[PDB]
Amino acid sequence: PTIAHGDGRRPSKQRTFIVVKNCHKHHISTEMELSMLDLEILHSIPETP
Amino acid sequence: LSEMVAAVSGESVLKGVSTYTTAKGGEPVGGVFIVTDNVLRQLLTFLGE
Amino acid sequence: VEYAEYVGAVKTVASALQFGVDALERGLINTVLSVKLRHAPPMFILQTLA
Amino acid sequence: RQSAAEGLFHSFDLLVGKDAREAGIKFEVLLGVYTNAIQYVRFLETALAVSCVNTEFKDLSRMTDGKIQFRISV
Amino acid sequence: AAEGLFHSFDLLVGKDAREAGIKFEVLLGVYTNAIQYVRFLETALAVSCVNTEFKDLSRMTDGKIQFRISV
Amino acid sequence: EVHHEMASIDTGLSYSSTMTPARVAAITTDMGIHTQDFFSVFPAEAFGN
Predict the structure, then answer these.
(1) Which other chains touch chain D, taking contact as 3+ CB pairs less than 8 Å apart?
(2) C1-4 — which CB contacts under 8 Å span 24+ positions?
(3) How far is A22 from chain C (nearest CA, A)?
(4) One-character DSSP codes across chain E
(5) Which residues of F touch C35 (CB under 8 A)?
(6) Chain E neighbours among B 1-49 (CB < 8 Å)?
(7) Residue F8: its chain D contacts at CB < 8 A?
(8) For E1, which residue in chain C has the nearest alpha carbon?
(9) Could you give the CA distance from residue E23 to residue C13 in angstroms, rounded to a whole number?
(10) C30 in contact with A, Cβ within 8 Å
């Protein structure tokens, strides 16, 4: 908005702005280690208790 | 604390989102004070109910 | 394409005119306030004078 | 602005003559977002209005002068 | 028309269209190349070859051919 | 250009409003030491030699 002034010499023009916003990008990591004994006895098949 | 609130404005571009509200309803939540554990306790003793 | 153009035209023009009439309202408020301040004498003078 | 269409979304596509293939140069309709910050204000809703009495004059511009005359007996 | 584009961000910008909304902006001009896609069995070099399809080439192991010619 | 005109009169004879400074927000001018030189006020005046 704007106020309309009289004593001011030339009436203020109405105002519009263009605002360009940027999106930041953040990436996130974690590491998990797993043993080959697990990764194998998983592929195998159980038969006994 | 109230001054810390007032320093922030609601001059936002998006103009309309679903809001968070209290359990008692009505008044929407205005923001978050993130603090420490001890400051949390001392603020709860300085402010009541 | 022209339908989109038309609705955009009406949105822009309506916003412009609304802001104009609002600026005239705020100008009226400011003119009344300044008229008051022009004829408001200072308290340190007006107390004993009144 | 570095690129003509950075901040804008892409909505429609104008294809030359007929909508066949991608060979035609084509026209893309881009959209933007507009926000209006105005908050409505009324002089009769301001607390300030009690101070003054307001009368609407249809053609003030014609008025050259106005006056009030008080007659006070002492 | 201006809807159907976003999942939610159009719902975030607000619906009132007297305060905020999505307008029209300038048209942009694009010219995209046209490419002729090539096939072997479609070129005329195929007149020379005799094209049979072997699913698994591995079965061909020796890779020798005995020509038995008679005169 | 949109032009708007208004008129106002005072209803009573004596003063009907009054303003007063309530709280000092800031001191704009430093109360420091800065002598004004006369050699820029009167530049044409000069001695003999």
Answers:
(1) A, B, C, E, F
(2) C1/D12, C1/D14, C1/D27, C1/D29, C1/E27, C3/E1, C4/D11, C4/D12, C4/D29, C4/E1, C4/E2, C4/E24
(3) 25
(4) ---SS-SSHHHHS-S-SSSEEE--EEEEE----------TTTSGGGGT------S-GGG--S---------
(5) 8
(6) 13-17
(7) 52
(8) C4
(9) 13
(10) yes
Mutate to test the interface with A, among C13, C15, C21, C26 (most CBs of A within 10 A): C26
Give the technique used to solve this structure: cryo-EM
Greatest extent of chain E over all pairs of C-alpha atoms, in Å:
96
Residue with structure tokens 């930041």? A24
In DSSP terms, which residues pair with D27 in a beta bridge? D14, E29
Which residues of chain C neighbour F2 with C-beta distances below 8 Å? Answer: 20, 24
Entry resolution in angstroms?
5.5
Contacts of E23 (CB under 8 A, 6+ apart): C8, C11, C12, D31, D32, D33, D34, E2
Backbone angles phi, psi at E20, to 5 degrees: -145, 150
